[PDB]
UniProtKB/Swiss-Prot annotation:
Tissues of expression: Ubiquitous, with the highest expression in skeletal muscle, liver, placenta, lung, peripheral blood leukocytes, kidney, spleen and colon.
Full-protein interval shown: 65 to 416 of 416
Encoding gene (name): IPMK
UniProt catalytic activity: 1D-myo-inositol 1,4,5-trisphosphate + 2 ATP = 1D-myo-inositol 1,3,4,5,6-pentakisphosphate + 2 ADP + 2 H(+); 1D-myo-inositol 1,3,4,6-tetrakisphosphate + ATP = 1D-myo-inositol 1,3,4,5,6-pentakisphosphate + ADP + H(+); 1-octadecanoyl-2-(5Z,8Z,11Z,14Z)-eicosatetraenoyl-sn-glycero-3-phospho-1D-myo-inositol 4,5-bisphosphate + ATP = 1-octadecanoyl-2-(5Z,8Z,11Z,14Z-eicosatetraenoyl)-sn-glycero-3-phospho-(1D-myo-inositol 3,4,5-triphosphate) + ADP + H(+); a 1,2-diacyl-sn-glycero-3-phospho-(1D-myo-inositol-4,5-bisphosphate) + ATP = a 1,2-diacyl-sn-glycero-3-phospho-(1D-myo-inositol-3,4,5-trisphosphate) + ADP + H(+)
Major subcellular site: nucleus
Activity regulation (UniProt): Inhibited by flavonoids that occupy the ATP-binding pocket. Inhibited by myricetin, quercetin, luteolin, kaempferol, isorhamnetin and diosmetin, and to a lesser degree by rhamnetin and apigenin.
This protein's name: Inositol polyphosphate multikinase
Amino acid sequence: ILQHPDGTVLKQLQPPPRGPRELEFYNMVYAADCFDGVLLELRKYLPKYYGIWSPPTAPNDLYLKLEDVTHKFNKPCIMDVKIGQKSYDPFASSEKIQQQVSKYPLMEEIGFLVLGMRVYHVHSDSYETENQHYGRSLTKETIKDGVSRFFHNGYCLRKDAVAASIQKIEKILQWFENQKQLNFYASSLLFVYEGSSGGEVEVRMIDFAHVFPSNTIDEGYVYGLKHLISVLRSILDN
Ligand SMILES: COc1cc(O)c2c(=O)c(O)c(-c3ccc(O)c(O)c3)oc2c1
């Protein structure tokens, strides 16, 4: 993900079929002639999309030009959380389903997975980062404390950012409770708050290489959001 100074990032398309599917998702949602109310409302929760991009001398090399959701922050604290009970799509082979469930076998039980975090610590004027193995190590016994770490700045728990995150997730949940036309697999929520207020908190949906047409509620995604809200809610009692 290449960061441009003008507040928009360039996300390289994943290899096929994943990159192409993510391009068609953004194109569908941000279609200039779209008047589907479900899709127009969905735009509120995604990074703004500026179209396909490639370097002038390299039309082979495909990127999505997207809003940098951290741009308005001075010391952004960033957490990426995968949502859903299944991290594989409805058309995966048995081998791939097994590979995806083995990556984190608690996905069905918990409904979400912390992919990484970058947290600003006030006393040291520095960041502490957690990679993919942090969230994959969390169980039902340790998910609450695992999530809490994102909101602890070295001297206090940022309950303002926790409460704001609940309020922003709730609008996303309401969108999912009022649509029956898309199911989202291996998609995420990007959380951002100000490390240096309630407070600039940004919560945005990202990662759309496995979004499919459907006739039903995305039950796995709803389950994940609800459980994530419940965990964040319990953190307010710390
Ligand atoms: C579909 O994918 C997207 C779309 C986006 O719009 C952003 C985005 O805006 C962003 O800041 C980041 C990001 C930047 C720096 C980090 O350290 C980090 O963990 C995430 O990832 C994105 C991914």
